[PDB]
Structures are given as C-alpha cells and as structure tokens.
Write a protein that binds this ligand. Sequence first.
Ligand SMILES: OC[C@H]1O[C@@H](O[C@@H]2[C@@H](O)[C@H](O[C@@H]3[C@@H](O)[C@H](O[C@@H]4[C@@H](O)[C@H](O)O[C@H](CO)[C@H]4O)O[C@H](CO)[C@H]3O)O[C@H](CO)[C@H]2O)[C@H](O)[C@@H](O)[C@@H]1O
Ligand SMILES: OC[C@H]1O[C@@H](O[C@@H]2[C@@H](O)[C@H](O)O[C@H](CO)[C@H]2O)[C@H](O)[C@@H](O)[C@@H]1O
Ligand code: CL
Length: 252
Amino acid sequence: SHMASGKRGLAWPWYNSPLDPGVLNNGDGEVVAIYDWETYAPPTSTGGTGGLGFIGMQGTMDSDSSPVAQLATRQAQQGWATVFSLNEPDINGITPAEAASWYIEWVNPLAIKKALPAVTSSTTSGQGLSWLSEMISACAGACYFDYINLHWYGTSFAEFQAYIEQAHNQFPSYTIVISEFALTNGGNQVAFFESAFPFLDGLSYVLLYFPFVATSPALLQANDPGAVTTVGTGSCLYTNAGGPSSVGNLMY
Ligand SMILES: OC[C@H]1O[C@@H](O[C@@H]2[C@@H](O)[C@H](O[C@@H]3[C@@H](O)[C@H](O[C@@H]4[C@@H](O)[C@H](O)O[C@H](CO)[C@H]4O)O[C@H](CO)[C@H]3O)O[C@H](CO)[C@H]2O)[C@H](O)[C@@H](O)[C@@H]1O
Ligand SMILES: OC[C@H]1O[C@@H](O[C@@H]2[C@@H](O)[C@H](O)O[C@H](CO)[C@H]2O)[C@H](O)[C@@H](O)[C@@H]1O
Ligand SMILES: [Cl-]
C-alpha cells in the first residue's frame, strides 16, 4: 500500500487511563479516529489521543458522565469534526419517535458531521435496521445526519459480510460507520478481523470501522463482565501490559 485506506478507529473505554492510543497509531494512516461512548475526552496514559481525531458521543439521552445539557458545550470546547448519538436504542426501550424527537432537540444543533444512533444487527420485530428505518420516517425530513451507525456481533465472517452487504442494499444512499464489531465468544477473533479488514477497506460506502474493543483483557474483565460473557477477551486490541495484541497488530 502506497496510501492507507484510512477507515480504522479505536473504540476506547472510560477505564483506559493506563493505556496509550499512540501504541495503535504507527502514523501510516490506517488508524484515524477514536471514540469513548462519552462527550468527555478519552482517558489515556498521556492526556492525548495519539494523533487520532476524537468523535464525541451522546450514547444515552442524558447521564452524569455525558450530561446532554453540556453536549453543545463539549463539542465547542473540544472541536469535534463528527458526533455519534444513542448507543443501541433499538434494544433499550426507546421508540423511533422518542429517538427522532430527542435527536432533533439535542444532536441537530451541532453544526458538524452527525451519525444517527448505532443500531444492533437484530432482525427481531422492531429492532436493528427496521428500528433505524422507522426512526428516519419519524424524523419526517427534520433530522440532520451524514451517517448511519451499525453494530455487529455474530459467529462468522460470512454472516458479517452478508450483514454489511444487506445494510448497503437496504440503505444504498447512506454512508456507514461500524462503531462496534467482533465475533461472539468461542471463535477465532484474529481470523475474523484478518478477513474483515481487507473486505471493509475496499467499501467506499464505509467511512469508519471500530473493532470492539481497544482495551486489554484485564481491563475488560474488571470493568465489563457483560462484554466478557458475550464476546470474550479475544477481540481486545491491547495485551495486559498495554502493547498491541495479535488483533492490535492487524490495526497497523
Ligand atoms: O475516570 C474517567 C472518566 O470517568 C467518567 O465517569 C465514568 C463513566 O463515563 C462510566 O460510564 C460507563 C460508560 O463509559 C460505558 O461505555 C461503554 C459501553 O457503553 C459499551 O457497551 O462498552 C464499553 C466497553 O466496556 C464501555 O466503555 O458504559 C457503562 C454502562 O455500560 C457506563 O457505566 O461509568 C464509570 C463508572 O461509574 C464512571 O466512572 C467521568 O465522568 C469522567 O469525568 C472521567 O474522566
Ligand atoms: O449533518 C448534516 C450537516 O449538518 C450541518 O449543520 C446543519 C446546518 O447546516 C443547518 O442549517 O442547521 C442544522 C440544524 O441546526 C444543522 O445540523 C453541518 O454543518 C454539516 O457539517 C453536516 O454535514
Ligand atoms: Cl449487534
């Protein structure tokens, strides 16, 4: 490669104060972005983001850590070029109408690039892409957005490839961010990402992809037992020492 695809990002948890995002940015230009599911700056060992562009995220309608009253303030203080909105409202008992009304009130005013809420890969009634389609209808032309936002967790590369191709086929005029993806527990995460990266790097309609998750197994175990039961620790980009894992090595 003589010029990086430049689509890769760090999904950077709140508990990463010991870790350095610069470890996974060798400056070739494949890794360009970082988000932390919050509107405060990534907690890191350096106080910086290792040259990566931070994307603010209002992942809840309001929280002590991301007060929605401070969303506009934090964008202006930090100078984000992009903002992400609600995390998986399609499985958190938020109706498409509720999400549209909230998005217009709180996210619309940010005069930067904006992603609609990250939805799960569920096809069960009223979830996933069906939920997203219903939110865009509920928006009634009044939502300002640049990107749709996908999560995927499943059991094969074949399932993931089919999911992204179907998302593109069903929303052929929208640019896609993949803010979280990995296998569920019991597979080979390295083999999955070895297949996924070249596939995604070739898709002009994918702006950014963020493997779950840019942390160490020890920090994931300590702070997200839910992720460990669902995903396991095989998709952690860091070693327990804070170096690149075998999956981290794929980010370069
Ligand atoms: O000391 C660092 C900063 O701590 C800030 O307060 C944190 C608060 O932000 C934290 O909220 C977490 C979310 O951050 C967490 O986000 C991700 C999940 O949505 C996703 O599913 O998984 C990833 C990876 O594990 C998560 O990072 O989601 C959980 C709920 O699932 C929230 O609890 O909670 C911390 C513990 O209470 C809290 O200390 C503080 O506001 C900052 O000022 C400070 O810099
Ligand atoms: O997300 C679409 C685009 O939103 C733009 O900001 C919007 C303004 O142009 C418009 O006049 O007002 C709405 C609501 O206040 C804003 O969201 C951004 O400036 C663009 O970067 C973005 O592509
Ligand atoms: Cl999912």
